[PDB]
Amino acid sequence: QFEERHLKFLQQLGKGNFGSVEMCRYDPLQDNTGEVVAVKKLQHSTEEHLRDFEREIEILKSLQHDNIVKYKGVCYSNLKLIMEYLPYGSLRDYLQKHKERIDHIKLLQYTSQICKGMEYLGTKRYIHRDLATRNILVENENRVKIGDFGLTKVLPQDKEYYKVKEPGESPIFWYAPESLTESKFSVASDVWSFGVVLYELFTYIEKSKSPPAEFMRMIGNDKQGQMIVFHLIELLKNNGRLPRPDGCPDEIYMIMTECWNNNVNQRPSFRDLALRVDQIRDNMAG
Numbered sequence: 001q002f003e004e005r006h007l008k009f010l011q012q013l014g015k016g017n018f019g020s021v022e023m024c025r026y027d028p029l030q031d032n033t034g035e036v037v038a039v040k041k042l043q044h045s046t047e048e049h050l051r052d053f054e055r056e057i058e059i060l061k062s063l064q065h066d067n068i069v070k071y072k073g074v075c076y077s078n079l080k081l082i083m084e085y086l087p088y089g090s091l092r093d094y095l096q097k098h099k100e101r102i103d104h105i106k107l108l109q110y111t112s113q114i115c116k117g118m119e120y121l122g123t124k125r126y127i128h129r130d131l132a133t134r135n136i137l138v139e140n141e142n143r144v145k146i147g148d149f150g151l152t153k154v155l156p157q158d159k160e161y162y163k164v165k166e167p168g169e170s171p172i173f174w175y176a177p178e179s180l181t182e183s184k185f186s187v188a189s190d191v192w193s194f195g196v197v198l199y200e201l202f203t204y205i206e207k208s209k210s211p212p213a214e215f216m217r218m219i220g221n222d223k224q225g226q227m228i229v230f231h232l233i234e235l236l237k238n239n240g241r242l243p244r245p246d247g248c249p250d251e252i253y254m255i256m257t258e259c260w261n262n263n264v265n266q267r268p269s270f271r272d273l274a275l276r277v278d279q280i281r282d283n284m285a286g
């Protein structure tokens, strides 16, 4: 539906996994009245990555929710995914730049919207596998959207988990234990990663407080490569956990820690997380 020749490059926005996203103007009348859109492409096209990308596109096309980035279409010559452009960029960058202006009530509004977008995903038996603030986008001051689905899988019909081990860089510092040890991904592992997203938000993305920096400090920074994952596994098994962020209330920390349960079946559901967060937001209005 979108023709290559009318897509004008404006800037690179970011890179992630094996994808790249650009700001472009789609201007088929060539009178500079077209809309700005976001365009996702493969950094390096292979046959493997293209088939994954096609599935990614079909996944996003299938999702319609206030807190999920909107699909607009595709562009063929090398496949490109065209999405709505959200002008405040990624939540990771936004939070960092505006920390002095974003309060806890606002972080909890973002948290609630993330939970609802995630509950909608589970409704379609989709496992996100990559929840992190870098993957959430800001539409305006009062609304975020889950903004990338690069690693998202559909559960098989007969199982509540999906086993996968991709080559490359895995975001191991957001992973549930059973994802690290067994390569199992489920709604419950997404709940684990949501807890890390919640941790991220309450750190306001202070660099020295990122999950990689805190876990690497807990493991020892002398560790390289293959030994990191092994020491991370042992840490989590021994109930090593990210600390409570500066300023975070106990009740918000308890949500995180409950998400970070080694027992996959004892982690809360996305519907219950939303309820609890919304109840805490309501208790801050009075």
Ligand SMILES: Cc1cc(NC(=O)c2cnn3cccnc23)n(-c2cccc(Cl)c2)n1
Binding pocket: 013, 014, 015, 016, 017, 019, 020, 021, 038, 069, 083, 084, 085, 086, 087, 088, 089, 090, 093, 134, 135, 137, 147, 148
């Ligand atoms: C620093 C950075 C900025 C962005 N994005 C955007 O500002 C953006 C705006 N509308 N929009 C739509 C869809 C996707 N992204 C956007 N990203 C990024 C986000 C997701 C995936 C990837 Cl690979 C990068 N990183």
